[PDB]
Amino acid sequence: SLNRRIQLVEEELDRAQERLATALQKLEEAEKAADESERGMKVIENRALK
Amino acid sequence: SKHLIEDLIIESSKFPAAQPPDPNQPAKIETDYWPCPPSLAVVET
């Protein structure tokens, strides 16, 4: 019985690492997109004010 | 009918053991000695 308990816990842990790995790259991608919109701000604003 | 000695032995042979199981004890499926892994919902809760 203890062998199967170990197997189940190990599989759940591996799934947890995979989910964290996906979350980190999604975070980086969202941060970069926000930075890109932030640069777009001033050029659009300059054209509008002129 | 007309023999009451050994038909009770026949009735005793129906269970997996020759004696009926204890009502207090759980079944073989829920006793956590089953070889097949359980479902995700039960192990999560």
Side-chain angles (χ1 to χ4, degrees), chain B residues 13-36:
Chain B
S13 79
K14 301 193 187 294
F15 315 119
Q19 49 204 351
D22 197 43
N24 294 339
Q25 291 296 317
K28 299 294 288 184
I29 315 164
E30 322 165 317
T31 187
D32 204 67
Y33 274 140
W34 200 269
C36 183

Side-chain angles (χ1 to χ4, degrees), chain B residues 1 5 8 10 12 15 18 21 25-26 28 31 38-39 42-45:
Chain B
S1 295
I5 300 299
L8 61 85
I10 294 182
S12 287
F15 315 119
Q25 291 296 317
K28 299 294 288 184
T31 187
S39 169
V42 184
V43 69
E44 201 186 340
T45 183

